[PDB]
Design a protein around this ligand. Structure first.
Ligand code: CLA
Ligand code: CLA
Ligand code: CLA
Ligand code: CLA
Ligand code: CLA
Ligand code: CLA
Ligand code: CLA
Ligand code: CLA
Ligand SMILES: CCCCCCCCCCCCCCCC(=O)OC[C@H](COP(=O)(O)OC[C@@H](O)CO)OC(=O)CCCCCCCCCCCCCCC
Ligand SMILES: CCCCCCCCCCCCO[C@@H]1O[C@H](CO)[C@@H](O[C@H]2O[C@H](CO)[C@@H](O)[C@H](O)[C@H]2O)[C@H](O)[C@H]1O
Ligand SMILES: COC1=C(OC)C(=O)C(C/C=C(\C)CC/C=C(\C)CC/C=C(\C)CCC=C(C)C)=C(C)C1=O
Lengths: 138, 80, 64, 161, 104, 53, 739, 53
């Protein structure tokens, strides 16, 4: 579960943050644990102060969360971050890391989606799928 | 959503997964290559179509391919 | 037999090096779908000079 | 034929061009003192102009109704100097440049410095090839008949079709 | 003759061609905007405009149904080419007409 | 010059419409598409539609 | 403290045959033609070569000596051409009726036609650099003095080249030396600017003043004493300026009013030469020298006295601006890009100020009625200014990508600017649309109304008036200021504001410039074009590191083509791409400025006066009624004034005809690069490579199409060269014929 | 006379570009290599580099 009452980094605010679409379509949350108070760069621009302990931020896009995640990992060696999608109705999907392990590391249990049992040069010609719903890359 | 496909020339280097800024891709077990893993695209609803994955792929021709398709708010990269 | 040090001609049409000659660097065990690693003098458009091929996709020119 | 043209020595328009050109230069000449550097410069232009017009008059180049030399490039030998002979000269020189350049390229490919010798020329090697260009037509012809000029179509890379 | 279709002293029947001639130049040059500047510049600019609209009192009563985005990469090429081609024809047509009318 | 060059661009367009060394699988992307991204050196204006343009 | 490391870098030619030695990426050598371009593009990007700030600083300092050497060679060349290949002396004797020339062409393939009839028995290219007027004001009266200055220039060049070598290879300063910003400022204010101005005052008083006074009285140059005669024989000076009888006693006793004969506050212009009074120029430089020498005692160096720059900055914070200027001192002592950004912005802005000030207060004798020189100097200095301003944007963006850190900028002014970048850019966007509509829109209204036969509905002086009343009011203040708010000044700073018509020969030097509707309209065009150029560059800087579209843009760097066709398409998001686009708008903006200048001066200022006093302007006052429509600019400016350049074949101005066409060609060629993309070109190259492979003549360095970014760079560089050189040829051909 | 010449030559120009545009579209959408093997159309593609160069 997320925990909506988790505290946030210290930040004076900006105009780069989320707009109406975050309220009535979807927004994203990233949480992490830091050992110490530390300044980091907001993906919406500006310096913010990481609390020691738990940290919660909301963003409009998944890419903003992951961008921050990459910064946490690279600059601060924090790899305990979690990303969630938050709907207006209150529902919460956990997104990343999906199964506990980062996607770049092989993990048993995962199943191949969107793989093909051929090389790219063995796709059929467009004319063959003319007047049917198939694609050449299906 | 954009279509992302992984072809059987993949050598399981992981570079596409590392390149992806939207967490569309992941490595799954496989027998077909020495690395014993293949790239997978389980979350193409989050794919923005930036093609950083293809830039990263070392094989000739590519083992990962992005076919740009039906646009959504997600795919267009809108924060409004 | 293709083996380390063989000169091979490439028969994969989508290859940058289609119809060109490369040097076999290693041949992988068995079960690997593309076990023949070949190195080339020319870099492709991505800047790489090595690729993995199947036996069907290459033909030997010189012996070693 | 060429009834619309006339020899430039028979052309009244071509002669008037000389007169008017010189008349302008002599007006320019009158603004300067005899013996001055400016005066001598204008005199040299007058002499050079006269030489040019007289040279064309004595050549048998044809003139249009504009009173300007028009060149015939259909192959007839009475106008060979206007295009055919320049053409042979160009082909001989350009073929030389191409042939010696092709020879150098091939020589360095048979070394470990195939790339280095493209940006930092092996000047002795280059001069050897450059010196050998004078019989490029025969060289090229023999290379063609030997089957050394061209690669086979199956040995050159192509894209999908 | 063309560029004197209108001037400070008055107008003649080439006035319309004079105006069209300038219209052609304007349309042609507007084409260069789409051909030279490419999409990403504009998408970032439109984001700031979406921001301003939502944060302006009174105005932010009114809401778009379609999210504003910059034209596509291919769309820009096509719109640029359209302006270039229309401008080409609307420049040359008045010139070819007014040049001849003006002379004869 | 104009006839030959216009023809060059259009013929190169048609004969490379299905694929090239830079994009061997171009027929899978269709007549008109923006590009194939900045990888492999960059691929702006690679489609057969771009040849028309 | 002087801190140096000795014998750092050996001097040999080993690395000269190792191209790209300076970069890890390039040192391995080419596999592809892309490498050849990268070598040149990366040669002076020193911070991409190494992470060491000390190493970067040393290369820069040494490169600067290299630049100074090049400038001395160029300067030396100008003096030498003056001495050897010019009509300077003839012009000195008769400056109203001789055109300056200091370039002569060799007689090959008929090009000697370019040696124009400039007078003084001389034939050569007419120059527009203003060198002759400069040299006259300096008191140079013969070719020997030019020769010796040329030689001194070659000596200085060699000395700069030695210092560059020495301070890189032999005695390279440590980083701590470069970061002595307090000491640098003290020396550049008091030493470079202060003593420079004092030294020049010395020249002015002892050399320029007497020689020019004798020239203007009508003494023949050859009959004037040499400069040292005035120094050794004080009586020669005291004849011209009696206060020299009193010597230096007035100076030390503060009876400075005794020197009011050679230190003046006249204003206006010398009536003989049409230039500023040299006695005013002398006093200007003395005053400036004093202020600068005082200014250079502000900062603390090796003693207790003076300010810390850091302390000043840290104190300036208020309730709207968080931590204020905290952290800026660290930025400006660790980032060369941050320094370059400021210094380019100011140097460029200054060049533009020089353009305006020099036309309206012409400082040299016989400058004002040398119309080719006036037009050339204004135009040249405007362009230099524009390019520098765009550079400021480039280096501000490079700083944001490479040198900015959040930890250094927590709640300071820089942090707070980027935290409301959407508010800034949205408002600037709006002001640009507003200005565009209410400036350019007025011209379109006017074109439409005049085409429709409704002149009474136009915005014009004789219909709906838009008077620039504020500018008109300022003109009036400046015209009445002498003897009022400036009681001890005798005449206006400039006759451009009002007052007399000054004429030299029968040519107008300067006269009042009336401002009406046409002036109101074109001023709002300038406001518009400058705001748009600012928009593009500011946006580049504020969004260099990230945006809503690309959250990790900084990781992609300053110069990258895009982030792929996704998110709708992301071409030209980088900071570099904003500079690219900003160059076109700077070009657009400055083109209209120089066109405004050219037309306004010809219509309303330059021309002839009769003895009766009847002014005849070059284009006869057509600006007011013609410059209020686009058709008027097309017809009465471009079409009408292009007659000179377009009819130049077969004359000494034929070079300008050729350059005009050549420049149109280069401009059009640029469009091949700007409108196309490399995917097309790389495919074409594949077929051509096939033919070379077939004939066994393919290179081992594989041909590639230019990078996406290089395509853009090549495009804008040809667009600017072609565009600017077209105007150059247009302007020179015209002004040399009629002026 | 001037209007009519210019009108028809411009129309012709557009038609020629369209002809080639539709030729490219044909190669992507409608061309079947299998069913054209070694005919005059397939042999154009076989020497496309010779044509283009
Ligand atoms: C259109 C193509 C063409 C080509 C390839 C040539 C080629 C040649 N012509 Mg030319 N010729 C041409 C048209 C051409 N001609 C036309 C239309 C005329 C009439 C105006 C001529 C009149 C002409 C003359 C009078 C002569 C040539 C000659 C030549 C030869 C030198 C060369 C074979 C010369 C020759 O000796 O032919 C064997 C020669 O004397 N031609
Ligand atoms: C030895 C060098 C050499 C040779 C034999 C050729 C030969 C050819 N070129 Mg290639 N070419 C070259 C260099 C060379 N090229 C270079 C350096 C470039 C880059 C500008 C090109 C770019 C080029 C293009 C774009 C095209 C050709 C084409 C061709 C073919 C037709 C003729 C032509 O159009 O030339 C035109 C080439 C030029 C005008 C480029 C200038 C050639 C330079 C001056 C030669 C350089 C010489 C070299 C420095 C000498 C060093 C030797 C020394 C060290 C001993 C012909 C096979 C055409 C083709 O494919 O037809 C089927 C074609 O479209 N070439
Ligand atoms: C003539 C050529 C042309 C024109 C008209 C434009 C117009 C514009 N450019 Mg563009 N630009 C151009 C060439 C041109 N550009 C080129 C070649 C480049 C490549 C370098 C660019 C690159 C570029 C950049 C990077 C930017 C601009 C921006 C702008 C906008 C500035 C704001 C403004 O003035 O709004 C007012 C609009 C005008 C003055 C246009 C004409 C208005 C007409 C005369 C009045 C209205 C007529 C009426 C309502 C018509 C109704 C008819 C209908 C009902 C049938 C403006 C829309 C900037 C921007 O967006 O600013 C916010 C911006 O950042 N341009
Ligand atoms: C004002 C102009 C100027 C100045 C001061 C410099 C200065 C420099 N260049 Mg640059 N360069 C310039 C213009 C300039 N360049 C231009 C127009 C280009 C083409 C893009 C280059 C391309 C370039 C490359 C490719 C390289 C340099 C390098 C250098 C550095 C070492 C040069 C040296 O030691 O030789 C000493 C010079 C002399 C003894 C006098 C010159 C004698 C020649 C033969 C004339 C030095 C900082 C080199 C470097 O190491 O970068 C870090 C390097 O590899 N430059
Ligand atoms: C930026 C600096 C600069 C520039 C652009 C020029 C340009 C020129 N010089 Mg000048 N020159 C310069 C500096 C410069 N010079 C300096 C510093 C000196 C003192 C050494 C000279 C001394 C000089 C002499 C003595 C002559 C020139 C000449 C020329 C002209 C022909 C040069 C030539 O064809 O080379 C040819 C290249 C060779 C390698 C020989 C050309 C207009 C020539 C001239 O004006 O002829 C009438 C000429 O005779 N120059
Ligand atoms: C006199 C002999 C000399 C020699 C043998 C060296 C040798 C060296 N220098 Mg040194 N240096 C010298 C003089 C010399 N330098 C001078 C006079 C200066 C002051 C500018 C320097 C300042 C300097 C710097 C700042 C650096 C070096 C470096 C080096 C090393 C690399 C040089 C290289 O590969 O680029 C060869 C480059 C060239 C031959 C091009 C130079 C172009 C000159 C400077 C300007 C040309 C004028 C103008 C732009 C021409 C325009 C033409 C027009 C068409 C536009 C090498 C050990 C570099 C290094 O990495 O050392 C560790 C380095 O960073 N040098
Ligand atoms: C009085 C002291 C003094 C003077 C006159 C200068 C002058 C200069 N410095 Mg500064 N500098 C100084 C002290 C001084 N510096 C100190 C103490 C530091 C350490 C804190 C620096 C650190 C520094 C750096 C890091 C750099 C400079 C640079 C410059 C040049 C800027 C470009 C320019 O304006 O060209 C104007 C050109 C001239 C005035 C012609 C050349 C002048 C020569 C060098 C002699 C001037 C002094 C001499 C004693 C006067 C002779 C008088 C005569 C009657 C005998 C300029 C030559 C830049 C540069 O270009 O370096 C090469 C640069 O990068 N300086
Ligand atoms: C004091 C002034 C100054 C200084 C010291 C610098 C220094 C630098 N600039 Mg900055 N910049 C400046 C002014 C300056 N710039 C101005 C005025 C502009 C606006 C145009 C810029 C815009 C700019 C951009 C967009 C970029 C830089 C970059 C750089 C860095 C690398 C430059 C390089 O390696 O190119 C080597 C030099 C060349 C390849 C020369 C190209 C010559 C061009 C095409 C013009 C030549 C035309 C000529 C005058 C006329 C015709 C010539 C004839 C032969 C036909 C270097 C730190 C680059 C960087 O990445 O920094 C991190 C970068 O991308 N600058
Ligand atoms: C220049 C005049 C600007 C006056 C703004 C007023 C001014 O100077 O305010 C200055 C005010 C001062 O704040 P502080 O007292 O904290 O300043 C202490 C300083 O030491 C640190 O900056 O700053 C602000 O309130 C933020 C600026 C908002 C700016 C909003 C308006 C921007 C657009 C301006 C349009 C007019 C342009 C006309 C140009 C001729
Ligand atoms: C004086 C001017 C004469 C009039 C103009 C006519 C000029 C004609 C000259 C072209 C010469 C043909 O050149 C020759 O072409 C044929 C067919 O493409 C190629 O011939 C070969 O191509 C491939 C192998 O490479 C195979 O299909 C087959 O073995 C053969 O057809 C040769 O590699 C080439 O040398
Ligand atoms: C999107 O815009 C474009 C591209 O991609 C971004 C391109 O790539 C090209 C094609 C241009 C290229 C490849 C550059 C041309 C360079 C030259 C002439 C080759 C240099 C060769 C030499 C130095 C050797 C010659 C030797 C001597 C003469 C001594 C064009 C036109 C373009 O519009």
């Amino acid at each position: 579960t997320l925990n909506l009452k988790m505290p946030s980094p210290s930040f004076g605010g900006s105009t780069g943050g989320w707009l109406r679409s975050a309220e009535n379509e979807e927004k994203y949350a990233i949480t992490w644990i830091s050992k110490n108070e530390e300044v980091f760069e907001m993906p919406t621009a500006g310096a913010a102060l990481m609390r020691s302990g738990e940290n919660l931020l909301y963003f409009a896009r998944k890419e903003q969360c992951l961008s921050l995640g990459t910064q946490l990992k690279t600059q601060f060696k924090i790899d305990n971050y979690k990303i969630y999608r938050v709907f207006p109705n209150g529902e919460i999907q956990y997104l990343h890391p999906k199964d506990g392990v980062f996607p770049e590391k092989v993990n048993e249990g995962r199943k191949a989606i969107n793989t093909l049992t051929r090389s790219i040069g063995k796709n059929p010609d467009p004319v063959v799928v003319k007047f049917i719903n198939k694609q050449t890359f299906e | 959503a954009h279509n992302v496909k992984i072809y059987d020339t993949c050598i399981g280097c992981t570079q596409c997964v590392r390149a992806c800024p939207c967490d569309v891709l992941e490595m799954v077990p496989w027998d077909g290559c020495k690395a014993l893993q293949i790239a997978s695209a389980p979350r193409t609803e989050d794919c923005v179509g930036c093609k950083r994955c293809e830039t990263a792929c070392p094989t000739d021709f590519l083992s990962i391919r992005v076919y740009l398709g039906a646009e959504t708010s997600r795919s267009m990269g809108l924060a409004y | 037999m293709v083996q380390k040090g063989s000169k091979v001609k490439i028969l994969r049409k989508e290859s940058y090096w289609y119809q060109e000659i490369g040097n076999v660097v290693t041949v992988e065990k068995s079960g690997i779908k593309y076990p023949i690693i070949v190195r080339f003098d020319k870099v492709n458009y991505a800047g790489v000079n090595t690729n993995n091929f199947a036996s069907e996709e290459v033909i030997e020119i010189e012996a070693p | 034929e060429f009834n619309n043209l006339i020899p430039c020595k028979e052309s009244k328009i071509f002669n008037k061009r000389l007169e008017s050109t010189i008349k302008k230069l002599e007006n320019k000449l009158s603004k300067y003192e005899v013996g001055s550097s400016s005066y001598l410069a204008i005199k040299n232009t007058i002499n050079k102009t006269n030489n040019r017009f007289h040279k064309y008059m004595e050549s048998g180049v044809l003139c249009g109704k504009d009173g300007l030399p028009h060149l015939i490039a259909d192959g007839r030998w009475s106008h060979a100097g206007e295009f055919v002979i320049p053409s042979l000269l160009f082909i001989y020189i350009s073929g030389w440049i191409g042939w010696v350049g092709r020879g150098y390229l091939s020589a360095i490919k048979n070394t470990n410095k195939a790339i280095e010798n493209e940006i930092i020329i092996d000047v002795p090697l280059a001069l050897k090839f450059m010196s050998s260009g004078f019989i490029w037509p025969l060289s090229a012809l023999r290379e063609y008949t030997k089957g050394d000029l061209l690669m086979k179509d199956s040995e050159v890379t192509i894209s999908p079709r | 003759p063309l560029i004197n279709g209108y001037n400070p002293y008055g107008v003649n029947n080439l006035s319309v061609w004079a105006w069209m001639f300038l219209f052609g130049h304007l349309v042609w040059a507007t084409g260069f905007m789409f051909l030279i500047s490419w999409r990403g510049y504009w998408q970032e600019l439109i984001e700031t405009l979406a921001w301003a609209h939502e944060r302006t009192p009174l105005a932010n009563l009114i809401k778009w149904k379609d999210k504003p985005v910059a034209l596509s990469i291919v769309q820009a090429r096509l719109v640029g080419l359209a302006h270039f081609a229309v401008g080409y024809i609307l420049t040359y047509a008045p010139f070819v007409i007014a040049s001849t009318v003006g002379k004869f | 010059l104009g006839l030959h060059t216009t023809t060059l661009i259009l013929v190169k367009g048609a004969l490379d419409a299905r694929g090239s060394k830079l994009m061997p699988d171009k027929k899978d992307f269709g007549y008109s598409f923006p590009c194939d991204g900045p990888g492999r050196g960059g691929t702006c204006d690679i489609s057969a539609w771009d040849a028309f343009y | 403290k002087v801190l140096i490391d000795r014998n750092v870098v050996p001097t040999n030619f080993e690395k000269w045959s190792k191209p790209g030695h300076f970069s890890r990426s390039l040192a391995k050598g080419p596999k592809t033609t892309t490498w050849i371009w990268n070598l040149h593009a990366d040669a002076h990007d020193f911070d991409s070569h190494t992470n060491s700030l000390e190493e970067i600083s040393r290369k820069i300092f040494s490169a600067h000596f290299g630049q100074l050497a090049v400038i001395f060679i160029w300067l030396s060349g100008m003096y030498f051409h003056g001495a050897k290949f010019s009509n300077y002396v003839a012009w000195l004797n008769n400056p109203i009726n001789i055109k300056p020339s200091a370039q002569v062409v060799w007689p090959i393939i008929g090009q000697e036609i370019l040696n124009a009839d400039v007078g003084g028995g001389f034939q050569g290219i007419q120059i527009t650099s203003g060198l002759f007027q400069l040299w006259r004001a300096s008191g140079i009266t013969n070719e020997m003095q030019l020769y010796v200055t040329a030689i001194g220039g070659l000596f200085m060049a060699s000395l700069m080249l030695f210092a560059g070598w020495f301070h890189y290879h032999k005695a390279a300063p440590k980083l701590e030396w470069f970061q002595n910003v307090e000491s640098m400022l003290n020396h550049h204010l008091a030493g470079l600017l202060g003593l420079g101005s004092l030294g020049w005052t010395g020249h002015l008083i002892h050399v320029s003043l007497p020689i020019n006074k004798l020239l203007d009285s009508g003494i023949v140059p050859a009959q004037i004493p040499l400069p040292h005669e005035f120094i050794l024989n004080r009586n020669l000076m005291s004849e011209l300026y009696p206060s020299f009888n009193k010597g230096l006693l007035p100076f030390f006793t503060l009876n400075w009013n005794e020197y009011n004969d050679f230190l003046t506050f006249k204003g206006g212009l010398n009536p003989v030469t049409g230039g500023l009074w040299l006695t005013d120029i002398a006093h200007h430089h003395l005053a400036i020298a004093v202020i600068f020498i005082i200014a250079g005692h502000m900062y603390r160096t090796n003693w207790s006295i003076g300010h810390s720059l850091k302390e000043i900055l840290d104190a300036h914070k208020g309730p709207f601006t968080g931590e204020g200027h905290r952290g800026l001192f660290e930025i400006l002592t660790t980032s060369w890009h941050a320094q370059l950004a400021i210094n380019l912005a100011m140097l460029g802005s200054l060049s533009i100020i020089v353009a305006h000030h020099m036309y309206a207060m012409p400082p040299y004798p016989y400058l004002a009625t040398d119309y080719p020189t006036q037009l050339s100097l204004f135009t040249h200095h405007m362009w230099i200014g524009g390019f520098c301003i765009v550079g400021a944007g480039a280096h501000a963006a490079i700083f944001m990508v490479r040198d900015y850190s959040p930890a250094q900028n927590y709640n300071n002014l820089l942090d707070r600017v980027i935290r409301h970048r959407d508010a800034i850019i949205s408002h600037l966007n709006w002001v640009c649309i507003f200005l565009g509509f209410h400036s350019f829109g007025l011209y379109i209204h006017n074109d439409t109304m005049r085409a429709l036969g409704r002149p009474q509905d136009m915005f014009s002086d004789v219909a709906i008036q838009l008077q620039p009343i504020f500018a008109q009011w300022i003109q009036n203040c400046h015209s009445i200021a002498p003897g009022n708010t400036a009681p001890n000044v005798l005449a206006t700073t400039s006759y451009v504001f009002g007052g007399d018509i000054i004429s030299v020969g029968n040519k107008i030097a300067i006269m009042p410039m009336s401002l009406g509707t046409a002036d109101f309209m074109v001023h709002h065009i300038h406001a518009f074009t400058i705001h748009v150029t600012a928009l593009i560059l500011l946006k580049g800087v504020l969004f260099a590191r990230n945006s809503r579209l690309i959250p990790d843009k900084a990781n992609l760097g300053f110069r990258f083509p895009c982030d792929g066709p996704g998110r709708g398409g992301t071409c030209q998001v980088s900071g570099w791409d904003h500079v690219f686009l900003g160059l076109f708008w700077m070009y657009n903006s400055l083109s209209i400025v120089i066109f405004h200048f050219s037309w306004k001066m010809q219509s309303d200022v330059w021309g002839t006066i009769s003895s009766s006093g009847d002014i005849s302007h070059i284009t006869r006052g057509n600006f007011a009624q013609s410059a209020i429509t686009i058709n008027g600019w097309l017809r009465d400016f471009l079409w009408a004034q292009a007659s000179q350049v377009i009819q130049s074949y077969g004359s000494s101005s034929s070079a300008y005809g050729l350059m005009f066409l050549g420049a149109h060609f280069v401009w059009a060629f640029s469009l091949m690069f700007l409108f196309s993309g490399r995917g097309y070109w790389q495919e074409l190259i594949e077929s051509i490579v096939w033919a070379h492979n077939k004939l066994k003549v393919a290179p081992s360095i594989q041909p590639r199409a230019l990078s996406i970014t290089q395509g853009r760079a090549v495009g804008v560089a040809h667009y600017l060269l072609g565009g600017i050189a077209t105007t150059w040829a247009f302007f020179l051909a015209r002004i040399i014929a009629i002026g | 006379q001037a209007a009519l010449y210019t009108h028809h030559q411009y129309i012709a120009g557009f038609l020629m570009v369209g002809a080639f545009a539709h030729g490219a579209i044909f190669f992507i959408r409608d061309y079947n290599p299998e069913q054209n093997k070694n005919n005059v159309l397939a042999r154009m593609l076989e020497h496309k580099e010779a044509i283009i160069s």
